[PDB]
Design a protein around this ligand. Structure first.
Ligand SMILES: [Mg+2]
Ligand SMILES: [Mg+2]
Ligand SMILES: [Mg+2]
Length: 217
RNA sequence: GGGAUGCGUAGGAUAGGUGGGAGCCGCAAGGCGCCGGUGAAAUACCACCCUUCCC
């Protein structure tokens, strides 16, 4: 454990209080920020890249891009993803730097049918890689609706070259208990992949534009 | 810790990074951002992690 429901709820409730969080012209998001000490990057001490489905659904859906198959096309549309790219539309993207880079930047997940895995990696890959993103395969079944929905509420817990973990934990209109639970999920995904309880320095939580609040331990 | 600092090319520009982000400051006017665009990467705003210097 890196934290506990109670200390997290304590911090989160404080991060959402008008004291630490002024009101804005949009529903802000809540973030979890974990920093680490004495961690050796080149040794895989804190190498992360975990897909984490949030237990308590936020009022803001994560942007998902989906490249289905004729069969899945309609089911994909149902899940109402950020954008649906048919296999034909994908081919036409080859060579188009701008549209591809846009797609890579304004989308969090890229779900590709196994038949377009190669196509997607060549056309979207070079744009996803540097952005810390990547494509993930869709199941071969026809109704993908649920899979997409799952990613519409999944966050990426990854590290690149800094001893820290920054993740979207939900929106500010949620109950501290719920945010605390998603925080747990993110936390559990870190522990699961690496024992860094001793390297942990601090854990902050905050709204998109509110003051950071350290979690007590 | 507080104040500074970071100059290939392209990008109205000295882009150290990353997460949040569709808004931010302002009575307003207006500025800034998104958008559009360039790029390997995007920039307001909120934060966290760095380089170098000062205290
Ligand atoms: Mg440069
Ligand atoms: Mg970003
Ligand atoms: Mg910056």
């Amino acid at each position: 454990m890196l934290a506990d429901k109670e200390s997290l709820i304590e911090a989160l409730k404080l991060a959402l209080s008008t004291e630490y969080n002024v009101k804005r012209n949009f529903t802000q998001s809540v973030e979890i920020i974990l920093t680490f000490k004495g961690i050796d990057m080149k040794k895989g001490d804190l190498k992360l890249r975990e897909i984490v489905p949030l237990p308590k659904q936020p009022s803001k859906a994560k942007r998902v891009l989906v490249v289905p198959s004729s069969e899945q096309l309609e089911y994909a549309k149902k899940a109402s993803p950020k954008v649906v790219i048919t296999r034909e539309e994908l081919q036409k993207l080859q060579g188009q730097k701008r549209p591809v880079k846009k797609l890579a930047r304004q989308n969090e997940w890229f779900l590709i049918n196994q038949e377009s895995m190669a196509l997607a990696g060549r056309i979207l890959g070079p744009a996803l890689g540097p952005r810390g993103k990547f494509p993930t395969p869709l199941p071969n079944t026809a109704d993908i609706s649920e899979y997409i929905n799952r990613f519409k509420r999944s966050v990426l817990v990854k590290t690149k070259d800094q001893p820290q973990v920054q993740v979207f934990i939900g929106t500010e209109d949620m109950k501290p208990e719920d945010l605390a639970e998603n925080a747990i999920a993110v936390l559990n995904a870190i522990e699961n992949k690496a024992k860094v309880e001793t390297n942990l320095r601090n854990i902050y939580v905050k709204t998109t534009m509110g003051k950071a609040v350290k979690v007590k331990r």
